Design an enzyme around this catalytic site. Structure first.
Site, short mmCIF file in Angstrom:
data_model
loop_
_atom_site.label_atom_id
_atom_site.label_comp_id
_atom_site.label_asym_id
_atom_site.label_seq_id
_atom_site.Cartn_x
_atom_site.Cartn_y
_atom_site.Cartn_z
CG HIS A 113 -16.10 32.50 25.84
ND1 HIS A 113 -15.71 33.35 26.85
CD2 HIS A 113 -16.75 31.47 26.43
CE1 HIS A 113 -16.11 32.85 28.01
NE2 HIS A 113 -16.74 31.71 27.78
CG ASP B 149 -16.41 36.48 26.86
OD1 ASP B 149 -16.96 35.86 25.92
OD2 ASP B 149 -16.17 35.97 27.97
CB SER C 67 -17.42 30.00 30.66
OG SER C 67 -17.03 30.98 29.73
N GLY C 68 -19.96 32.22 30.80
CA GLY C 68 -21.16 32.73 30.15
C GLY C 68 -22.24 32.98 31.19
O1 LIG Z 1 -10.43 30.92 30.64
C1 LIG Z 1 -10.73 30.05 29.82
C2 LIG Z 1 -9.75 28.85 29.79
C3 LIG Z 1 -9.53 28.19 31.15
N1 LIG Z 1 -10.68 27.43 31.60
S1 LIG Z 1 -11.05 27.44 33.26
O2 LIG Z 1 -9.74 27.30 34.14
O3 LIG Z 1 -11.99 26.19 33.53
C4 LIG Z 1 -11.89 28.95 33.59
C5 LIG Z 1 -12.62 29.59 32.57
C6 LIG Z 1 -13.29 30.79 32.84
C7 LIG Z 1 -13.24 31.35 34.12
C8 LIG Z 1 -13.89 32.53 34.42
C9 LIG Z 1 -13.81 33.05 35.72
CL1 LIG Z 1 -14.63 34.54 36.11
C10 LIG Z 1 -13.09 32.40 36.72
C11 LIG Z 1 -12.42 31.22 36.44
C12 LIG Z 1 -12.48 30.67 35.16
C13 LIG Z 1 -11.82 29.48 34.88
N2 LIG Z 1 -8.47 29.19 29.09
C14 LIG Z 1 -7.41 29.97 29.80
C15 LIG Z 1 -7.08 31.32 29.12
C16 LIG Z 1 -6.55 31.15 27.69
C17 LIG Z 1 -6.21 32.50 27.00
N3 LIG Z 1 -6.94 33.77 27.35
C18 LIG Z 1 -6.64 35.09 26.72
C19 LIG Z 1 -7.34 36.26 27.09
C20 LIG Z 1 -7.02 37.47 26.47
N4 LIG Z 1 -6.08 37.55 25.55
C21 LIG Z 1 -5.39 36.48 25.17
C22 LIG Z 1 -5.64 35.22 25.73
C23 LIG Z 1 -8.01 33.62 28.41
C24 LIG Z 1 -8.30 32.25 29.06
N5 LIG Z 1 -11.47 30.40 28.70
C25 LIG Z 1 -12.88 30.91 28.85
C26 LIG Z 1 -13.89 29.76 28.67
S2 LIG Z 1 -13.68 29.01 27.03
O4 LIG Z 1 -13.82 30.02 25.84
O5 LIG Z 1 -14.68 27.81 26.83
C27 LIG Z 1 -11.97 28.50 27.16
C28 LIG Z 1 -11.15 29.78 27.37
#
Ligand SMILES: O=C([C@H](CNS(=O)(=O)c1ccc2cc(Cl)ccc2c1)NCC1CCN(c2ccncc2)CC1)N1CCS(=O)(=O)CC1
Ligand SMILES: [Ca+2]
Lengths: 235, 51
Positions: free
Chosen positions: A42, A88, A185-186
């Protein structure tokens, strides 16, 4: 990295930071070899054009040992989609060879089987990056590292509001305020086995940062091990 | 055999060659003489914190 600890001199060599046109650190990455960086799939969306930095522990102070590398080709996992966040994982091949030095070495790629039983079954794990200090806070200057416990594969699916495929896994805490976050992330998640570190997982996602009743969701390296090779050996 | 006794007293990866245990190491490591511990061929081996 929320809470956790500061990577001192030489501790987090495998670390890698992807920077955007404005030379801003937005994503992490893991050094596999000389021209190969492991990162989330991502993170290849979070920007238009990016380079990858190495040997940097401070995003402001030029500690001499920093160095930037351009991307020659990008291998993003086809079975990926943000709809599910399954697969991912992405392998980057650098235009010029990373020269190893202090604060800049690689992380070992373990064998799938031995990894799935000796590394993953380990108590803790190491995650790091230049991410935010708290959920809705600022990015970090100094590079941090957090020891995140392996979280029960089952109680992973409960806590979560989304499907948790066996292509990924939990790790972190329930209540304690330690987790990854935007920017991390990554990046890398490495297990320490007998004084050496392996690439056990990739920082993927999570419901907030250090939120009670939620765990940090990483990509399962072993689950992609053989995929990783074909990329480096190209294909 | 028994890579689960203590990793087969290995340093890294551990396998079971039917009969007994077989140790080995990751890219950039050569298996020591005792066939267990691992030895790095270069100055910057994977998995090692750089001091
Ligand atoms: O989780 C997030 C962000 C949040 N950002 S964050 O709080 O700073 C955050 C991000 C990654 C983490 C990884 C770890 Cl190991 C621990 C804590 C983390 C905290 N969006 C929230 C969620 C939005 C929807 N999602 C799904 C997954 C599967 N199926 C459907 C939906 C996953 C992430 N992601 C991943 C990074 S991105 O693509 O730039 C934005 C979407
Ligand atoms: Ca710098």
């Amino acid at each position: 990295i929320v809470g956790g600890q500061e990577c001192k001199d030489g501790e987090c060599p495998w670390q890698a930071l992807l920077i955007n046109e404005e030379n801003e650190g937005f994503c992490g990455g893991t050094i596999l070899s000389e021209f190969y960086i492991l990162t989330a799939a991502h993170c290849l969306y979070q920007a238009k054009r990016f380079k990858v930095r190495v040997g940097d522990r401070n995003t402001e102070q030029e500690e001499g040992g920093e160095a930037v590398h351009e991307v020659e080709v990008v291998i993003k996992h086809n079975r990926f989609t943000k709809e599910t966040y399954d697969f991912d994982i992405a392998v980057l091949r650098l235009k010029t060879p990373i020269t190893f030095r202090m604060n800049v070495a690689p992380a070992c790629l373990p064998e799938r089987d031995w990894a799935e039983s000796t590394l993953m079954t380990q108590k803790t794990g190491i995650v790091s990056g230049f991410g935010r200090t708290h959920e809705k806070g600022r990015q970090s200057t100094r590079l941090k590292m957090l020891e995140v416990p392996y979280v029960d594969r089952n109680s992973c699916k409960l806590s979560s509001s989304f499907i948790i495929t066996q292509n990924m896994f939990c790790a972190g805490y329930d209540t304690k305020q330690e987790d990854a976050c935007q920017g991390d992330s990554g990046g890398p998640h490495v297990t320490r086995f007998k004084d050496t570190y392996f690439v056990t997982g990739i920082v993927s996602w999570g419901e907030g940062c250090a939120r009670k009743g939620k765990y940090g969701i990483y990509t399962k390296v072993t689950a992609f091990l053989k995929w990783i090779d074909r990329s480096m050996k190209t294909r | 055999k028994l890579c689960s006794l203590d990793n087969g007293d290995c340093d890294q990866f551990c396998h079971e060659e039917q009969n007994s245990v077989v140790c080995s190491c990751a890219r950039g490591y050569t298996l020591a003489d005792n066939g267990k511990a691992c030895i790095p061929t270069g100055p910057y081996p994977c998995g090692k914190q750089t001091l």
